[PDB]
């Protein structure tokens with residue numbers, strides 16, 4: 001056996017057989033934390049056009 | 052970037068804008084990070100998703116017992132506890148935080 | 153009555169003891185769904 005951080009692959013599947021995956025692996029994206037805006041149209045917001 | 056840790060520093064210094072790698076090894080580094088300044092967008096948007104697993108000998112006849120037992124932990128809530136272990140961090144990828152600047 | 157199931161079918165351990173599965177073609181969880189609540193402040197009157 002080869003328990004570890006082994007990613008299931010098509011090429012590896014035809015030379016060795018794997019088990020049911022216990023951890024999901026994909027292709028993700030990082031980014032720095034966003035500070036956050038303040039809805040630049042905020043001044044007309046705390047009311048309604050009817051009011 | 053030839054080093055995973057070095058790429059983060061370049062990303063944290065504004066040199067880069069996005070580091071792309073495996074979810075199971077990049078989510079852990081996003082969770083375990085001081086300041087919680089790194090957030091991923093791999094919330095179900097992971098592309099070409101293949102899980103981990105236990106390799107065998109292609110005829111080892113251990114596949115069925117291993118799969119049955121491994122699915123038992125996944126069927127139960129066993130693997131989740133091990134995820135709250137090492138594969139976790141103090142930082143939360145979820146926002147759970149409001150800032151007024 | 154059939155030889156091969158092609159449909160969203162979650163992998164478990166009970167059913168795995170009578171069949172053989174394949175590698176999943178999609179990964180998903182179980183998230184509670186609730187009706188979205190439209191925000192509206194009560195504020196009965198300015199007298200409140």
Ligand SMILES: O=C(O)[C@@H]1[C@H](C(=O)O)NCCN1C(=O)c1ccc2c(ccc3ccccc32)c1
Nearest residue numbers: 005006007008009025055056073076077079080
């Ligand atoms: O999928 C990959 O690219 C390979 C391998 C495979 O099946 O080839 N599958 C698993 C991923 N991986 C790697 O080389 C790799 C790359 C980087 C880290 C780790 C493991 C732990 C870390 C901890 C901190 C920073 C980086 C790492 C493994």
